[PDB]
Amino acid sequence: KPYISAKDLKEIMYDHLPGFGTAFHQLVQVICKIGKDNNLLDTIHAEFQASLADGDSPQCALIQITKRVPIFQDVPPPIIHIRSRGDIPRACQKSLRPAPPSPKIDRGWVCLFKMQDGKTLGLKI
Structure with missing residues (x-):
């Protein structure tokens, strides 16, 4: 522990x-x-x-x-399921980017937001 x-x-x-x-x-x-x-x-x-x-x-x-x-x-950015784009905190909105094929956490891809409608945006720093 x-x-x-x-x-x-x-x-x-x-x-x-x-x-x-x-x-x-x-x-x-x-x-x-x-x-x-x-x-x-x-x-x-x-x-x-x-x-x-x-x-x-x-x-x-x-x-x-x-x-x-x-x-x-050694692990991919986590996929976080949400309902719509409005579920994402206002302060993060500016940092959303189209999701590339191979996002890496160590290159600033925090996570992937997978919407209910099936769409996907990456959070990039």
Whole structure:
């Protein structure tokens, strides 16, 4: 069992972020779910801290996690099912892009939004 829970890591990360419902907030969620599912929460937490200690901003640290914690190169961006495009947080809207064939988390593709109508948009940082 992890010293830090998915819920608590999310809160710690959220505490460091400006605004609400940004692409970074969504990235926090992707990171925590991947960490929780693969039992890497503590590793992820430490990497977050280490990046901040290097002098990186919190946004930059989240990006660093995707490049430095190996698992984020080895799994595809999560597919998140929603009903319509309005379900996506306002702050994320500006970051939606057509979904390429091979999006990579470590290149900024946070997740894929799959709508009810069958359409798909990627979230890109």
